[PDB]
Amino acid sequence: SMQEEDTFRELRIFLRNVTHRLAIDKRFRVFTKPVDPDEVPDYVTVIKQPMDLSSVISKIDLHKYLTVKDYLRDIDLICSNALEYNPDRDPGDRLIRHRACALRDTAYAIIKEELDEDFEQLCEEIQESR
């Protein structure tokens, strides 16, 4: 219905705002664009599903997220990819892992504070009905 399309449009608006707030945070700069193959050529061979915040914005706009849970799966993938690819003890790896965990935790905390659980539930029920 038009009511349902309005619900998904509101979801997109909400997700874009959250993603923008993550993307402008200087700690998360490394997650704002895909990893550069020129710089890291083995990335695309090791990490099977690359994800970054620009790709997340693209996916919102393509209506790929019908629930906050679908969205958080991609935030989680940004984080898990960084933990997997940078697992070492050295400071460079430890810094990126800390930032990756912060990205994930920040996204979850924004959603916890600002998403009404009944709004998420409605999205889930519309999605499940399709």
Ligand SMILES: COC(=O)c1cc(N)cc(-c2c(C)noc2C)c1
């Ligand atoms: C576009 O992404 C970057 O600018 C960038 C920069 C650094 N220093 C590391 C990484 C990176 C990520 C994210 N995951 O593994 C590496 C290496 C990406």
Ligand SMILES: [Cl-]
């Ligand atoms: Cl830095």
